[PDB]
Design a binder for this molecule. Structure first.
Ligand SMILES: *[C@@H]1O[C@H](CO)[C@@H](O[C@@H]2O[C@H](CO)[C@@H](O)[C@H](O)[C@H]2NC(C)=O)[C@H](O)[C@H]1NC(C)=O
Ligand SMILES: *[C@@H]1O[C@H](CO)[C@@H](O[C@@H]2O[C@H](CO)[C@@H](O)[C@H](O)[C@H]2NC(C)=O)[C@H](O)[C@H]1NC(C)=O
Ligand SMILES: *[C@@H]1O[C@H](CO)[C@@H](O[C@@H]2O[C@H](CO)[C@@H](O)[C@H](O)[C@H]2NC(C)=O)[C@H](O)[C@H]1NC(C)=O
Ligand SMILES: *[C@@H]1O[C@H](CO)[C@@H](O[C@@H]2O[C@H](CO)[C@@H](O)[C@H](O)[C@H]2NC(C)=O)[C@H](O)[C@H]1NC(C)=O
Ligand SMILES: *[C@@H]1O[C@H](CO)[C@@H](O[C@@H]2O[C@H](CO)[C@@H](O)[C@H](O)[C@H]2NC(C)=O)[C@H](O)[C@H]1NC(C)=O
Ligand code: NAG
Ligand code: NAG
Ligand code: NAG
Ligand code: NAG
Ligand code: NAG
Ligand code: NAG
Ligand code: NAG
Ligand code: NAG
Ligand code: NAG
Ligand code: NAG
Lengths: 433, 49, 187, 198
């Protein structure tokens, strides 16, 4: 078929008709980002010329290709460590949640660390760790059981326990202090007042929270439950991360398979060449093999460099999201999940991070008549912060992102000019307290 | 580390090195049990040529 | 088949008609001895997973050695310490021999106190030269712990402040290199 | 060492070039790494083979060097784009992006040139001395609930003030600091107090 771009939806636009939401939803979305690769290291001398003096002497003619390949791989590993350090180690101290969980009715038990656990990982962290299978790797799985063939997988500098501790500190700081713990010393604050700050930060008056607090808390909990279900239902959600692993494995696999290629020589087995031919021609054969394996290593290293550049870009993006999303409150649209951003919660994952973006989404919309200004006594009155609306008979002033009509008063509106300029001004009475 | 970096002075840090330390290696040869012996016994020590 | 390696008692169960084991890269992994019906694993005899931790030669010449993913009893057999220089046998046994989840660390004094990481080793272990002075290995600290006195009707508000000037350095350009291909290759 | 990141870059390039130079000392399987010696010692029938070996080796070295340069230049271009964005949103304006212009709340930035790089001096505001206070989400005055326009309600023990949230500046609570909405049977934790009317 010819693919459909989306559902057709004409907007009932009109120069004096506005659509204002009357209700909202607290939506939690998931954003998955890779943060590091597997710190692969190849023993080039042992890979090309495994335990063979003559082969090593011949390879020594080719100068410092082997050395610079090893240096490049070491740089890659160091870069991955630096990426993880910069993404996660952004908090000076290690905060811990208090035993009391009086978080205004919100239930964080699925993201806070589990006390009865040795790894100090949360439920969602355990789900993520159990949803990353390694049965499709091959080399990365057979090396984890101990593939000792000159190829090794160095362990990451920060153990999963340390990453869990870092996420725990960030989460406790955000819950118990808001954004203050990111700028400097953590300054405590009740969580409800933090959400009031965020609502003011998105142009929604704080009372909207307090008048619908329990429902919002329930919605947040329900949203977290839905995330659980998603994690329980769809294993492919973390595809990207898995893909990264796969790619590396494939690379390694390809490299490993290159040991079976003759590259134009008479046999892929070095010992047979040594034992069968005379030195003058065995030298040419071993030169062919050395050139082939060196080219294979160069291709692998170049692919690793490009993929590590990709992963570094992803990690820089993730660090920026952690800075502007967790440690603060961003006003960048769709930078922290679809909708207006409220907050985000990080969660570790194998060689990656998973952000739960809690955002505010208008749900139930109503049609209201609108005006650009109202004419009271020949003067033109504009809303200080909001918009004029009319339910058919009377004119009120409401915040833009949530229908909360309020009588029009000289404290809601400011005066400017006269009614002979504004195109569309209407007549009404501005009540004076 | 000094030679692998091609310098007489080494800065602070953890470097990854090569493997220059060689070790003497003995040789072993293994083949199956000797069987399937010709009729040379009855060919050399034959009764009549 | 012919090769080089160390023969060790195996754990595999070869089939009655199979002779030579094999990995996914058509490489010998285990063998059946032609005379004795016993399976021997062939582990190559070479170690390239050796890292050398050093403070700057300006400060000192004492170093530590990290062998990757080995036990501290398997070190003088993995690198064949018996066939090495006696000055290398200092860094194969001894008293400063820690066992990290990354391998065997030798020449570093294992301390219990945690500090900010200086020279990263791995698996949460970092080393540094400290006080009479020697190399020490420690579980790196993630920062001083803290507890927020959180309660539903208590807020902490600052009363003073500091104007802090931090420094962020960013590279902008490289060196505009140019290579004469024909002169370089065929001068 | 503060500018190591720049030096590293420079150093890396140097190393690259250096390695390239040392790559002229390799035979790559030929009988000598010196073209002049091969030309002076061999006739074209075998000089062609030797020079082909040398050409293949040196061309491989050149390709490796060029690929490394391309990847490092892509990295440096990404960093330069980041620096340009930093100059746009950090010196020429005032970013509310957290930690994008130094730790703490961003006040301004000053750029300074440097060999093959730039240095941003990020001037930021950091709270230093802090005090505990008792707080309430809102206050009843006449049954109706009052919420603070900008800032939060706090109490030093006996009286209630309204203060901005980044600097303790207690102000008397009035009808120009707070706005009314609904009634105070809904807010959880609200406390009684008087709202002075000018
Ligand atoms: C906003 O929407 C929510 C959800 O659609 C409403 O909550 C529902 O309220 C009805 C009764 O009023 C209950 O039967 C439902 O179970 C509630 N839903 C959930 C998910 O709990 C809420 O009433 C709406 N508010 C406004 C002002 O429209
Ligand atoms: C937060 O939600 C979790 C569900 O994930 C609640 O845990 C359940 O609690 C009920 C009763 O307390 C038990 O019967 C279940 O067995 C619990 N399930 C799990 C998976 O723990 C938890 O009680 C909620 N917290 C609060 C304060 O309501
Ligand atoms: C528009 O809204 C206003 C205020 O919400 C309505 O005015 C009041 O309406 C209620 C019933 O909905 C009456 O009991 C009050 O007496 C009305 N107040 C006044 C001052 O008249 C108004 O009716 C609404 N109009 C429409 C068309 O919905
Ligand atoms: C909290 O601060 C207020 C004002 O800063 C203090 O109010 C004092 O009230 C008495 C009598 O009502 C006056 O004589 C003082 O002049 C007021 N103080 C000031 C600075 O004007 C109040 O006493 C303080 N309470 C606590 C517990 O510190
Ligand atoms: C704030 O003051 C009001 C009175 O103006 C309190 O309302 C009284 O509450 C008690 C029980 O809580 C009732 O028995 C009275 O009938 C209420 N009086 C009125 C006039 O409604 C209110 O409880 C006070 N708030 C707090 C937190 O103590
Ligand atoms: C608003 O009016 C348009 C047409 O005037 C109609 O199609 C639409 O459904 C209305 N929406 C609401 C929320 O009343
Ligand atoms: C609105 O009021 C102005 C005077 O304030 C008057 O001139 C004008 O005719 C009025 N328009 C309508 C539609 O009532
Ligand atoms: C809306 O458009 C109609 C049709 O042209 C016009 O009569 C009316 O004055 C317009 N009103 C506003 C507010 O633009
Ligand atoms: C022939 O017999 C003699 C002894 O009688 C023995 O030593 C020799 O090996 C035999 N030759 C062969 C070919 O078996
Ligand atoms: C070889 O001989 C030994 C003893 O004579 C026996 O144990 C072994 O099974 C034999 N192996 C083969 C392959 O014949
Ligand atoms: C090291 O010793 C432990 C026992 O504590 C054992 O489980 C492990 O397999 C040993 N390492 C190797 C490489 O065999
Ligand atoms: C570290 O503490 C452990 C007990 O947890 C103790 O057995 C060990 O001797 C200590 N080591 C040092 C160097 O203090
Ligand atoms: C804030 O700190 C500065 C420097 O430490 C000091 O001079 C000043 O008096 C302090 N202000 C207050 C109100 O404590
Ligand atoms: C705030 O109260 C906590 C609770 O004991 C205390 O630890 C802390 O020192 C107090 N801070 C100030 C500034 O009073
Ligand atoms: C705080 O929580 C305690 C119990 O945990 C409760 O008694 C008190 O009323 C609450 N106060 C506020 C302001 O939420």
């Amino acid at each position: 078929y010819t693919m459909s771009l989306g559902a057709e939806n004409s907007v009932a636009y009109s120069n004096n008709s506005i659509a204002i939401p009357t209700n909202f939803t607290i939506s939690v979305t998931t954003e998955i980002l890779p943060v590091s690769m597997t710190k692969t290291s190849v023993d080039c001398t042992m890979y090309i010329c495994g335990d063979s003096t003559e082969c090593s002497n011949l390879l020594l003619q080719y100068g410092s290709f082997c050395t610079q390949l090893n240096r490049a791989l070491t740089g890659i590993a160091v870069e991955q460590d630096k990426n993880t350090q910069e993404v996660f180690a952004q908090v000076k101290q290690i905060y811990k949640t208090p035993p009391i969980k009086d978080f205004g009715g919100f239930n964080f038990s699925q993201i806070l660390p589990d006390p009865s656990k040795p790894s100090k990982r949360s439920f969602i962290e355990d789900l993520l760790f159990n949803k990353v299978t390694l049965a499709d790797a091959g080399f990365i799985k057979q090396y984890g059981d101990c593939k000792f063939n000159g190829l090794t997988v160095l362990p990451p500098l920060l153990t999963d326990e340390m990453i869990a501790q870092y996420t725990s500190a960030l989460l406790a700081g955000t819950i118990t202090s808001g954004w203050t713990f990111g700028a400097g010393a953590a300054l405590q604050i009740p969580f409800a007042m933090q959400m009031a700050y965020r609502f003011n930060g998105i142009g929604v008056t704080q009372n909207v929270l307090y008048e619908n607090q329990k429902l919002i808390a329930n919605q947040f909990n329900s949203a977290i439950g839905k995330i659980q279900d998603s994690l329980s239902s769809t294993a492919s959600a973390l595809g990207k991360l898995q893909d990264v692993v796969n790619q590396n494995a494939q690379a390694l696999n390809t490299l490993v398979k290159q040991l079976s290629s003759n590259f134009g020589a008479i046999s892929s087995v070095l010992n047979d060449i040594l034992s069968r031919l005379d030195p003058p021609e065995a030298e040419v054969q071993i030169d062919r093999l050395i050139t082939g394996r060196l080219q294979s290593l160069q291709t692998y290293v170049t692919q690793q460099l490009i993929r590590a550049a990709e992963i570094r870009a992803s990690a820089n993006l993730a660090a920026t999201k952690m800075s502007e999303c967790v440690l603060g409150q961003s006003k960048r649209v769709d930078f922290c999940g679809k909708g207006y951003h409220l907050m985000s919660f990080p969660q570790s994952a194998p060689h990656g991070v998973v952000f739960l973006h809690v955002t505010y989404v208008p749900a139930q919309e109503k049609n209201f008549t609108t005006a650009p200004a109202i004419c009271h006594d020949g003067k033109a009155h504009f809303p200080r912060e909001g918009v004029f609306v009319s339910n058919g008979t009377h004119w009120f002033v409401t915040q833009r992102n949530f229908y909360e009509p309020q009588i029009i008063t000289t404290d809601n509106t400011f005066v400017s000019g006269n009614c002979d300029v504004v195109i569309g001004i209407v007549n009404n009475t501005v009540y004076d307290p | 580390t000094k030679c692998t970096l091609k310098s007489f002075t080494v800065e602070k840090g953890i470097y990854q090195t090569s493997n220059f330390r060689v070790q003497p290696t003995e040789s072993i040869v293994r083949f199956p049990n000797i069987t399937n012996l010709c009729p040379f016994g009855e060919v050399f020590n034959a009764t009549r040529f | 088949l012919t090769g080089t390696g160390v023969l060790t008692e195996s754990n595999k169960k070869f089939l009655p008609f199979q002779q030579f084991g094999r990995d996914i890269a058509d490489t010998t992994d285990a063998v059946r001895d032609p005379q004795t019906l016993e399976i021997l694993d062939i582990t190559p005899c070479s170690f390239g997973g050796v890292s050398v931790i050093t403070p700057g030669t300006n400060t000192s010449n004492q170093v530590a050695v990290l062998y990757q993913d080995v036990n501290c009893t398997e070190v003088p057999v993995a690198i064949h310490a018996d066939q090495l220089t006696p000055t290398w046998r200092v860094y194969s046994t001894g008293s400063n021999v820690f066992q990290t989840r990354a391998g065997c660390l030798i020449g570093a004094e294992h301390v219990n106190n945690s500090y900010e990481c200086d020279i990263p080793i791995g698996a949460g272990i970092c080393a540094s030269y400290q006080t009479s002075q020697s190399i020490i290995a420690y579980t790196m600290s993630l920062g001083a712990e803290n507890s927020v006195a959180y309660s539903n009707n208590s807020i902490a508000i600052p009363t003073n402040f500091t104007i802090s000037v931090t420094t962020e350095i960013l590279p902008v350009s490289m060196t505009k290199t140019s290579v004469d291909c024909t002169m370089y290759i065929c001068g």
